[PDB]
CSV table of C-alpha atoms in Angstrom, one decimal:
chain,number,residue,atom,x,y,z
C,1,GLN,CA,-3.7,26.0,-7.6
C,2,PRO,CA,-5.4,22.5,-6.8
C,3,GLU,CA,-3.6,19.5,-4.5
C,4,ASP,CA,-1.6,16.8,-5.3
C,5,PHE,CA,1.5,17.2,-3.2
C,6,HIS,CA,3.9,13.8,-3.5
C,7,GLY,CA,3.2,11.8,-0.9
C,8,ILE,CA,4.4,8.1,-1.4
C,9,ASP,CA,7.8,7.3,-2.7
C,10,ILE,CA,7.8,3.8,-3.2
C,11,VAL,CA,5.6,0.8,-1.9
C,12,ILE,CA,8.2,-1.7,-0.5
C,13,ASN,CA,6.3,-4.4,-0.3
C,14,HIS,CA,2.5,-5.6,1.4
C,15,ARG,CA,0.4,-8.0,3.0
C,16,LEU,CA,-2.6,-8.9,4.3
C,17,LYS,CA,-3.8,-6.3,6.3
C,18,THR,CA,-3.3,-7.7,10.0
C,19,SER,CA,-2.6,-4.4,11.5
C,20,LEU,CA,-1.3,-6.9,14.7
C,21,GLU,CA,-5.6,-8.0,14.9
C,22,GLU,CA,-5.4,-11.4,13.1
C,23,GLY,CA,-8.4,-13.8,13.4
C,24,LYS,CA,-9.0,-15.2,10.1
C,25,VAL,CA,-7.0,-16.5,7.2
C,26,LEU,CA,-8.0,-15.8,3.6
C,27,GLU,CA,-5.7,-18.3,1.0
C,28,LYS,CA,-7.4,-16.1,-2.3
C,29,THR,CA,-4.4,-14.5,-2.7
C,30,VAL,CA,-4.6,-11.1,-4.5
C,31,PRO,CA,-5.5,-11.5,-9.1
C,32,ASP,CA,-7.1,-7.7,-8.9
C,33,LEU,CA,-6.9,-4.8,-6.9
C,34,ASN,CA,-10.5,-5.1,-5.6
C,35,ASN,CA,-8.9,-8.7,-2.9
C,36,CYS,CA,-6.2,-6.6,-1.8
C,37,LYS,CA,-8.0,-2.9,-1.7
C,38,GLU,CA,-10.5,-5.0,0.7
C,39,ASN,CA,-8.4,-6.9,2.8
C,40,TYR,CA,-4.5,-6.1,2.4
C,41,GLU,CA,-1.7,-3.4,3.5
C,42,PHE,CA,1.1,-2.7,1.6
C,43,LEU,CA,5.0,-1.2,2.9
C,44,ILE,CA,5.2,2.3,2.0
C,45,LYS,CA,8.5,4.0,1.8
C,46,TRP,CA,7.6,7.5,2.4
C,47,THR,CA,10.1,10.3,1.4
C,48,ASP,CA,13.3,10.3,3.5
C,49,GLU,CA,13.7,13.2,5.4
C,50,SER,CA,15.6,11.6,8.4
C,51,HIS,CA,14.0,10.2,10.5
C,52,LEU,CA,11.4,8.8,8.7
C,53,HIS,CA,11.5,5.2,7.6
C,54,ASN,CA,9.6,3.2,5.3
C,55,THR,CA,5.9,1.9,6.9
C,56,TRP,CA,3.2,-0.6,6.5
C,57,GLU,CA,-0.1,1.7,5.7
C,58,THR,CA,-3.2,0.4,4.0
C,59,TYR,CA,-5.0,1.8,1.2
C,60,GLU,CA,-7.6,3.4,4.1
C,61,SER,CA,-4.5,5.5,5.1
C,62,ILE,CA,-2.6,6.0,2.1
C,63,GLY,CA,-5.6,5.8,-0.5
C,64,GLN,CA,-5.1,9.7,-0.6
C,65,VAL,CA,-2.1,11.2,-1.2
C,66,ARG,CA,-0.5,10.1,-4.8
C,67,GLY,CA,-0.2,6.5,-2.7
C,68,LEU,CA,-2.5,4.7,-4.9
C,69,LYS,CA,-1.4,5.8,-8.1
C,70,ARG,CA,2.6,4.0,-7.0
C,71,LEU,CA,0.2,1.6,-5.3
C,72,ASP,CA,-2.0,1.0,-8.1
C,73,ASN,CA,1.4,0.2,-10.4
C,74,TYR,CA,2.5,-2.0,-7.1
C,75,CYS,CA,-0.6,-4.1,-6.8
C,76,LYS,CA,-0.3,-4.9,-10.8
C,77,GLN,CA,3.1,-5.6,-10.7
C,78,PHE,CA,2.6,-7.7,-7.5
C,79,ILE,CA,-0.8,-8.2,-6.9
C,80,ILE,CA,-2.1,-8.3,-10.7
C,81,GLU,CA,-0.8,-8.1,-14.5
């Protein structure tokens, strides 16, 4: 019995991983998944059980729950092609 339980339902959107920290700007946009994967966050629509709502996580926190899969198709449908 491996481990692949669901985790990310939908990537509502994304943006620079400011994490309320901010400090410098980057006009390099996001061509591939590295630019983002190296400095970007993503609104993760998690399972809407009742009190849980979309949130803005980052691969450093959603890179291990099936998110990268839906997040990968999101970065390619929104940050790459």
